[PDB]
Amino acid sequence: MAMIHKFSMMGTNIVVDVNSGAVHVVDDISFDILDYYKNFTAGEIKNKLAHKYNADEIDEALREIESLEAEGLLFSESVVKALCLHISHDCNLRCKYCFASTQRNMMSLEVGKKAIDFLISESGNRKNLEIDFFGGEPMMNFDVVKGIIEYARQKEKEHNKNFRFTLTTNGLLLNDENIKYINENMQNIVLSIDGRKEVNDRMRIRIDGSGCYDDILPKFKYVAESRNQDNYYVRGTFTRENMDFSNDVLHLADEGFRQISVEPVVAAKDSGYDLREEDLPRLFEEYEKLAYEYVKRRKEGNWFNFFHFMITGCGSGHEYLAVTPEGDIYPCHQFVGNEKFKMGNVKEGVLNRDIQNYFKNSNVYTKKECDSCWAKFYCSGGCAANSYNFHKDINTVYKVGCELEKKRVECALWIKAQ
Numbered sequence: 001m002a003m004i005h006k007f008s009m010m011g012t013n014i015v016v017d018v019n020s021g022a023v024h025v026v027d028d029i030s031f032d033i034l035d036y037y038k039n040f041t042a043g044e045i046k047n048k049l050a051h052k053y054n055a056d057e058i059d060e061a062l063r064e065i066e067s068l069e070a071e072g073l074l075f076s077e078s079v080v081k082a083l084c085l086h087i088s089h090d091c092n093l094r095c096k097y098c099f100a101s102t103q104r105n106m107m108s109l110e111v112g113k114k115a116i117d118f119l120i121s122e123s124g125n126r127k128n129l130e131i132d133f134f135g136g137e138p139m140m141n142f143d144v145v146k147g148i149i150e151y152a153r154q155k156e157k158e159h160n161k162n163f164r165f166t167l168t169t170n171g172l173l174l175n176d177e178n179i180k181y182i183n184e185n186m187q188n189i190v191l192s193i194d195g196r197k198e199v200n201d202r203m204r205i206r207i208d209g210s211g212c213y214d215d216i217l218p219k220f221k222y223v224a225e226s227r228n229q230d231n232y233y234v235r236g237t238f239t240r241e242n243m244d245f246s247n248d249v250l251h252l253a254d255e256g257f258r259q260i261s262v263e264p265v266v267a268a269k270d271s272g273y274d275l276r277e278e279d280l281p282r283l284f285e286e287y288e289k290l291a292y293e294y295v296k297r298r299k300e301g302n303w304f305n306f307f308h309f310m311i312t313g314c315g316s317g318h319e320y321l322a323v324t325p326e327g328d329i330y331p332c333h334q335f336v337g338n339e340k341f342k343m344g345n346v347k348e349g350v351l352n353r354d355i356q357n358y359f360k361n362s363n364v365y366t367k368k369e370c371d372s373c374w375a376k377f378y379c380s381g382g383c384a385a386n387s388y389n390f391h392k393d394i395n396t397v398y399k400v401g402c403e404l405e406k407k408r409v410e411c412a413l414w415i416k417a418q
């Protein structure tokens with residue numbers, strides 16, 4: 001499986017050798033060489049490239065590319081650590097693209113602590129433990145969150161562990177007092193806002209239809225600077241309704257957000273919101289359009305971090321598990337619908353292993369469609385929710401949500417070239 005990927009993006013030619021991880025910026029002549037190198041002689045390539053370059057400059061271009069091959073940078077040849085807590089399945093929003101379009105109960109405190117104990121028991125001897133407060137809207141049940149935190153740190157002393165708490169909130173229930181507590185206790189907070197106001201208020205709406213932009217932007221802007229524009233990010237979701245998502249990222253940057261994350265929709269088949277292949281040469285340009293601007297404001301007064309350019313696996317189902325409010329264990333937040341992937345309850349606290357191993361053995365070596373790919377050692381490993389939603393199987397590639405990430409890998413590699 002000796003292969004390379006070749007791309008040229010905004011006046012530069014970069015090459016990736018997949019097994020090595022080596023990255024090369026190359027000139028036009030050696031860039032056109034690799035169209036023929038592995039299958040043609042040095043004598044055959046002269047007659048081929050005898051309209052743009054001449055024999056000597058061709059051979060010198062062969063010289064080093066044949067030495068990178070000789071150097072070996074061309075053609076080279078389970079323990080659970082995090083729990084996604086569903087502190088609530090109720091919510092005060094009705095976002096179109098969200099799975100919570102279906103009941104409505106609150107995680108009890110006794111199920112929370114049975115979630116902390118389950119994590120410690122299955123953590124092996126890993127010291128760093130992650131607890132994500134998620135679900136519907138966790139702040140609707142903030143009493144329990146404070147109780148789970150105060151309970152975990154009593155356990156940190158006894159079990160030689162360390163808990164890393166993150167919250168993800170729609171914004172509506174942040175106030176002066178819970179924003180204090182959030183910054184002396186949560187290591188990271190995720191703010192859900194979709195960017196421009198017409199885009200956000202289009203779909204992050206309440207039961208009545210009214211939006212949430214005007215209410216969350218004031219408190220989001222502040223939580224960011226209360227924590228010095230770090231240890232947070234604003235989390236946006238672009239669907240078919242806003243494929244110009246670059247302005248969404250930059251509008252959030254213009255409002256003073258250094259840490260921004262904008263991602264495609266997951267498990268959005270047959271909703272009208274998912275992105276199709278026809279949109280791929282539409283979504284690509286704004287990724288490139290984005291990667292250009294981050295370099296443009298890299299060292300200037302303005303600057304912003306886009307999470308998907310910052311360069312294992314995602315871990316859902318073997319290293320990362322979601323806990324329903326009743327204690328039920330699921331591979332991730334996106335699977336608590338499907339009952340077949342039910343893996344146990346944190347009360348009884350014993351984990352189903354062969355669903356766990358079924359998920360652990362779904363990596364870039366396992367699936368046949370990945371072994372052909374150039375970004376296998378650069379990828380997230382895919383999204384199991386997207387695979388089962390588009391093909392009812394955890395181990396077949398979801399072609400769109402995949403060429404998106406390959407372009408982000410291409411955009412992240414390209415930023416580091418400057």
Ligand SMILES: C[S@@+](CC[C@H](N)C(=O)[O-])C[C@H]1O[C@@H](n2cnc3c(N)ncnc32)[C@H](O)[C@@H]1O
Nearest residue numbers: 097098135136137168169170192235237265266
């Ligand atoms: C599921 S919500 C739960 C936490 C909290 N209520 C909030 O929105 O911040 C967390 C994040 O997941 C994202 N999300 C919801 N449904 C999604 C979907 N179908 N595809 C991709 N992201 C989604 C939303 O953008 C939201 O920011």
Ligand code: SF4
Nearest residue numbers: 091093095098136170
């Ligand atoms: S707020 Fe979070 S949970 Fe409620 S709908 Fe919007 S995304 Fe789903």
Ligand code: SF4
Nearest residue numbers: 370373376379381382
């Ligand atoms: S990108 Fe999709 S296909 Fe290429 S490796 Fe990562 S997951 Fe497998």
Ligand code: SF4
Nearest residue numbers: 314316332383384385
């Ligand atoms: S499966 Fe898809 S959605 Fe569930 S965690 Fe891994 S990536 Fe996020």
Ligand SMILES: [Ca+2]
Nearest residue numbers: 156162163164
């Ligand atoms: Ca700690």
